[PDB]
RNA sequence: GGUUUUGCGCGAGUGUUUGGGUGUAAAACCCGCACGCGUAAAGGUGAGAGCUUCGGCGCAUCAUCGACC
């Protein structure tokens, strides 16, 4: 759209940012990361750390977690495996439960700067509703 | 920047330095700010009625 | 009268339940290269 | 006591050199095409 | 461990503060019983206070003479830290290469290219030392031209910790800007001497290596620019 | 935090600011090389920034900012 | 649920902040009168009555009279050197009376008494 | 500045937050050797000049 | 007093302000036990955004076949 809803100036920071990259790139990627950037917090479900240690299967494992939405700690989930996420907000458990883990916690930029076009990354939305 | 200077009666630097807190690198949200002022420059009010 | 003492044992369990709830939290938040350290 | 070029200007001097070469060359293609165009038409 | 009073004041506000620190450090890397027992840490807590010695210098010029005088510290080491002492500098580059704003940058990028064309002249004693010249290449391949994307420092055990540091993918895209560069000034490229190809062949190698195995798109194409530089004996 | 303290002046406040009714912002800051309120004339967003100022005495003098 | 005329009985709290310095002045007057006093009575642990908050314990009304001999506390006195005493309530198991016993005898290894003249 | 470090420890139910933003620099984030590298050759300029 | 939506903080937890402490005193700052509300008491196949070492991996959601109470 023309604006974010969000009065976070870091938000827009993020915004802007994504922009540029879905402007000057051919990455679907960047353009899934400035839609979901551009919608309302119901629209953006947290993800919890069960969701993402069942995508974290197959053969992603190696690959970089990106979450557009607050990654939430479950108290179902017993052991954590090593995983790196990259999410706008993490809870103090649930990044607490990643770093024992051996794995790691990342902001947008900080994937905006490693992984400018999103090569082996894993997108997980929360559930709706 | 780790450390800041601390100066002395004079205006001039003692050469002791101090470290700077984590609490001066914090976010810096002026719509948190807008909001909590907001309600906050209300909590002293004198009710009025006719 | 049985039945009106299950419910109050129901009532009573769902309230220890929520006290034993609230000791687990409580356990699970428990479970020299630095700036403050070095430019001390 | 020289102020040095600084490298990030270093590294967009080199893209735009670069890119200078590309653009006189697709210029100097598309004046081809162009004349073989008027012909053909 | 080793009594450092001159970190905390390498990065004061001060600038005469600051020399007078630098020339202290100075002072304590030339004392070779004091540097000969010099472990990882004492090196990455040095390499912090350097960093922020050049993080508050203010000028171009001053920027430059210390990015100059930060490289020439090689040469007041024993020869059994000196690899320990720049493995500290690309752990600590490869700390706080994000964290560094858009105009304090250049100059780093500067220390880091002055740093490594120190390196490269260390190797010089065949004419070049092969101990040497080893050391350095496995240091680059280790922190910028490695094909892991993380280095684990110090050991675990019940007195020291476990640092895992990754490499940021901007150091390795400058290392790749800047190392023929490097190669060139110091005369690693002339054309008569075998040893001297041979380690032009192993760095152009490692960054073959790196080329073929990696997954950043910007690494893949930063090093075929750089694997095809005109000064290089194959493009030639 | 260049971009951060110019969302902060630009959208909030800005003691400099003189807003008119004409389709133009000014700055009174005296450090501003043009009297506008923009993103590249900002003296305070900008971390590195030059003007030219003149002395009571005649002599004009340039002015240059560092971060 | 607004069918009466509840305008006439809306009472708000305005004077709340003035009540706490109102109260915290009267604890300051009886700390005047009770100088090296403490302003408060001991006061024993009971459990609480139900099921449901069995578990817990609170403070009680005041020491039952055979706590009170037990800790070696006469009954007269007790009031007079800042002990509550109870005379409805009883012990009735022997784990509140080694509780509450315990606990005066904490308070008696801390008190100092003054002669009375 | 030291009880400054002390007090915010001592605040239960609170710490400092976790910005969501980690480098809030956005011409290091943009004009970084990191984006510039992989990004495509610009459509345009900032004035387009009147085909017609 | 209900209900829908936008922003914000924290998040399986959340809510300091009944009250206590404190104060430069109706402000601001702190919180001992409760209490309210909420949580507790991973299957196959086919589409499917996105990623890909081009072999494939497949979010949310839907359809269908199954599992448990
Ligand atoms: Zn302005």
Redesign the pocket.
Request: charged share 30%.
């Given at each position: 759209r023309k604006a974010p809803?969000?009065?976070?100036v870091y938000?827009k920071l993020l915004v802007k940012l994504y922009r540029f990259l879905a402007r000057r790139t051919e990455?679907?990627?960047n353009?899934?990361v400035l839609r979901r950037l551009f919608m309302?917090?119901?629209?953006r479900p947290?993800v919890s750390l069960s969701?993402i240690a069942?995508?974290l299967?197959?053969?992603?494992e190696?690959?970089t977690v990106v979450v557009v939405?607050?990654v939430?700690?479950?108290?179902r989930l017993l052991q954590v495996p090593k995983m790196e996420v990259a999410a706008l907000?993490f809870?103090?458990?649930?990044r607490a439960r990643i770093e024992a883990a051996g794995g790691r916690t990342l902001t947008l930029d900080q994937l905006a700067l490693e992984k400018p076009?999103?090569?082996?990354?894993?997108?997980?939305?929360?559930?709706?509703? | 920047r780790p450390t800041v200077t601390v100066f002395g009666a004079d205006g001039k630097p003692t050469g002791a330095t101090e470290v700077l807190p984590k609490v001066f690198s914090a976010p810096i949200?002026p719509?948190?700010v807008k909001?909590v002022h907001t309600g906050?420059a209300k909590?002293?009010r004198?009710p009025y009625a006719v | 009268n049985k039945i009106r003492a299950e419910l109050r044992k129901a009532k009573a369990?769902?309230?220890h339940?929520?006290?034993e709830?609230q000791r687990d939290?409580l356990a699970?938040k428990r479970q020299d290269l630095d700036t403050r350290e070095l430019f001390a | 006591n020289d102020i040095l070029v600084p490298e990030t200007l270093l590294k967009k001097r080199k893209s735009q050199e670069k890119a200078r070469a590309e653009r006189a060359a697709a210029l100097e293609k598309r004046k081809q095409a162009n004349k073989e165009k008027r012909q053909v038409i | 461990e080793k009594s450092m009073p001159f970190i905390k004041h390498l990065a004061s506000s001060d600038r005469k503060v600051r020399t007078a620190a630098l020339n202290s450090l100075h002072a304590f890397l030339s004392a070779r019983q004091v540097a000969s027992a010099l472990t990882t840490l004492d090196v990455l807590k040095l390499w912090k206070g350097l960093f922020y010695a050049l993080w508050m210098c203010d000028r171009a010029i001053p920027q430059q003479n210390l990015c100059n005088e930060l490289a020439d510290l090689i040469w007041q080491l024993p020869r059994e830290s000196v690899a320990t002492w720049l493995r500290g500098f690309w752990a600590t580059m490869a700390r706080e290469w994000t964290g560094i704003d858009v105009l304090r940058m250049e100059k780093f990028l500067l220390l880091v290219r002055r740093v490594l064309g120190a390196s490269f002249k260390w190797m010089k004693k065949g004419a070049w030392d092969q101990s040497k010249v080893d050391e350095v290449l496995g240091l680059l391949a280790e922190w910028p031209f490695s094909l892991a994307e993380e280095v684990r420092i110090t050991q675990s055990s019940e007195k020291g910790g476990e640092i895992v540091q990754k490499i940021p993918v901007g150091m390795r895209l400058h290392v790749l800007d800047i190392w023929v560069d490097e190669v060139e000034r110091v005369g690693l490229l002339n054309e008569d001497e075998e040893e001297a190809r041979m380690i032009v062949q192993r760095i152009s190698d490692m960054v073959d290596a790196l080329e073929q195995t990696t997954?950043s798109p910007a690494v893949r194409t930063r090093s075929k620019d750089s694997l095809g530089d005109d000064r290089l004996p194959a493009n030639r | 935090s260049d971009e951060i303290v110019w969302q902060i002046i630009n959208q909030q406040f800005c003691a400099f600011k003189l807003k008119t009714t004409k389709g133009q912002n000014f700055c009174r800051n005296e450090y501003s090389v043009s009297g506008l309120c923009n993103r590249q004339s900002c003296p305070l967003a900008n971390s590195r920034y030059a003007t030219v100022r003149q002395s009571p005495k005649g002599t004009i003098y340039l002015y240059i900012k560092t971060i | 649920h607004f069918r009466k005329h509840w305008q006439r009985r809306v009472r708000c709290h305005?004077?709340?902040?003035?009540?706490?310095?109102t109260?915290?002045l009267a604890?300051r007057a009886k700390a005047a009168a009770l100088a090296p006093r403490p302003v408060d009575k001991l006061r024993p642990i009971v459990r609480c009555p139900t099921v449901k908050?069995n578990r817990?314990t609170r403070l009680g009304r005041g020491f039952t009279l055979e706590e009170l001999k037990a800790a070696g506390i006469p009954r007269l006195l007790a009031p007079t050197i800042g002990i509550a005493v109870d005379h409805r309530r009883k012990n009735l198991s022997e784990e509140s009376l080694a509780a509450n016993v315990q606990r005066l005898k904490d308070y008696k290894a801390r008190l100092i008494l003054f002669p009375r003249k | 500045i030291k009880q400054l470090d002390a007090v915010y420890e001592?605040?239960?139910?609170?710490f400092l937050?976790?910005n969501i933003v980690s480098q809030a620099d956005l011409s290091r984030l943009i004009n970084s050797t990191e984006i510039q590298s992989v990004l495509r050759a610009p459509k345009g300029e900032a004035r387009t000049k009147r085909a017609c």
């Amino acid at each position: 759209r023309k604006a974010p809803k969000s009065d976070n100036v870091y938000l827009k920071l993020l915004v802007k940012l994504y922009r540029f990259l879905a402007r000057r790139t051919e990455a679907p990627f960047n353009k899934v990361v400035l839609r979901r950037l551009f919608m309302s917090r119901i629209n953006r479900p947290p993800v919890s750390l069960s969701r993402i240690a069942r995508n974290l299967k197959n053969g992603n494992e190696k690959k970089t977690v990106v979450v557009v939405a607050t990654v939430t700690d479950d108290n179902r989930l017993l052991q954590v495996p090593k995983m790196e996420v990259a999410a706008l907000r993490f809870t103090a458990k649930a990044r607490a439960r990643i770093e024992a883990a051996g794995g790691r916690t990342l902001t947008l930029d900080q994937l905006a700067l490693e992984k400018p076009t999103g090569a082996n990354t894993l997108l997980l939305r929360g559930p709706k509703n | 920047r780790p450390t800041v200077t601390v100066f002395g009666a004079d205006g001039k630097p003692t050469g002791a330095t101090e470290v700077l807190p984590k609490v001066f690198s914090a976010p810096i949200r002026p719509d948190i700010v807008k909001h909590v002022h907001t309600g906050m420059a209300k909590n002293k009010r004198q009710p009025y009625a006719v | 009268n049985k039945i009106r003492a299950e419910l109050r044992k129901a009532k009573a369990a769902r309230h220890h339940a929520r006290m034993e709830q609230q000791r687990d939290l409580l356990a699970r938040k428990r479970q020299d290269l630095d700036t403050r350290e070095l430019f001390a | 006591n020289d102020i040095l070029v600084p490298e990030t200007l270093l590294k967009k001097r080199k893209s735009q050199e670069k890119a200078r070469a590309e653009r006189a060359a697709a210029l100097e293609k598309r004046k081809q095409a162009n004349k073989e165009k008027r012909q053909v038409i | 461990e080793k009594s450092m009073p001159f970190i905390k004041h390498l990065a004061s506000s001060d600038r005469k503060v600051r020399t007078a620190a630098l020339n202290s450090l100075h002072a304590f890397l030339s004392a070779r019983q004091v540097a000969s027992a010099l472990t990882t840490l004492d090196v990455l807590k040095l390499w912090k206070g350097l960093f922020y010695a050049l993080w508050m210098c203010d000028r171009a010029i001053p920027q430059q003479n210390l990015c100059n005088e930060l490289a020439d510290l090689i040469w007041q080491l024993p020869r059994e830290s000196v690899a320990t002492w720049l493995r500290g500098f690309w752990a600590t580059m490869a700390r706080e290469w994000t964290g560094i704003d858009v105009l304090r940058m250049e100059k780093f990028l500067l220390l880091v290219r002055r740093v490594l064309g120190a390196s490269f002249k260390w190797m010089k004693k065949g004419a070049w030392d092969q101990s040497k010249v080893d050391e350095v290449l496995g240091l680059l391949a280790e922190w910028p031209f490695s094909l892991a994307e993380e280095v684990r420092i110090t050991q675990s055990s019940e007195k020291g910790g476990e640092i895992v540091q990754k490499i940021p993918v901007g150091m390795r895209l400058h290392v790749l800007d800047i190392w023929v560069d490097e190669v060139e000034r110091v005369g690693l490229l002339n054309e008569d001497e075998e040893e001297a190809r041979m380690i032009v062949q192993r760095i152009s190698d490692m960054v073959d290596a790196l080329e073929q195995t990696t997954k950043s798109p910007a690494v893949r194409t930063r090093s075929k620019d750089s694997l095809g530089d005109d000064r290089l004996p194959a493009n030639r | 935090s260049d971009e951060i303290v110019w969302q902060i002046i630009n959208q909030q406040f800005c003691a400099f600011k003189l807003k008119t009714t004409k389709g133009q912002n000014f700055c009174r800051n005296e450090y501003s090389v043009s009297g506008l309120c923009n993103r590249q004339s900002c003296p305070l967003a900008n971390s590195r920034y030059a003007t030219v100022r003149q002395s009571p005495k005649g002599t004009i003098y340039l002015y240059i900012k560092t971060i | 649920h607004f069918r009466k005329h509840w305008q006439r009985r809306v009472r708000c709290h305005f004077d709340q902040p003035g009540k706490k310095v109102t109260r915290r002045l009267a604890r300051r007057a009886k700390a005047a009168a009770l100088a090296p006093r403490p302003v408060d009575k001991l006061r024993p642990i009971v459990r609480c009555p139900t099921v449901k908050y069995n578990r817990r314990t609170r403070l009680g009304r005041g020491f039952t009279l055979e706590e009170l001999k037990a800790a070696g506390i006469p009954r007269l006195l007790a009031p007079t050197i800042g002990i509550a005493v109870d005379h409805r309530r009883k012990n009735l198991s022997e784990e509140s009376l080694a509780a509450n016993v315990q606990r005066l005898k904490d308070y008696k290894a801390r008190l100092i008494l003054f002669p009375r003249k | 500045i030291k009880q400054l470090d002390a007090v915010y420890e001592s605040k239960k139910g609170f710490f400092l937050p976790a910005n969501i933003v980690s480098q809030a620099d956005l011409s290091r984030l943009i004009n970084s050797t990191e984006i510039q590298s992989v990004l495509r050759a610009p459509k345009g300029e900032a004035r387009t000049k009147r085909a017609c």
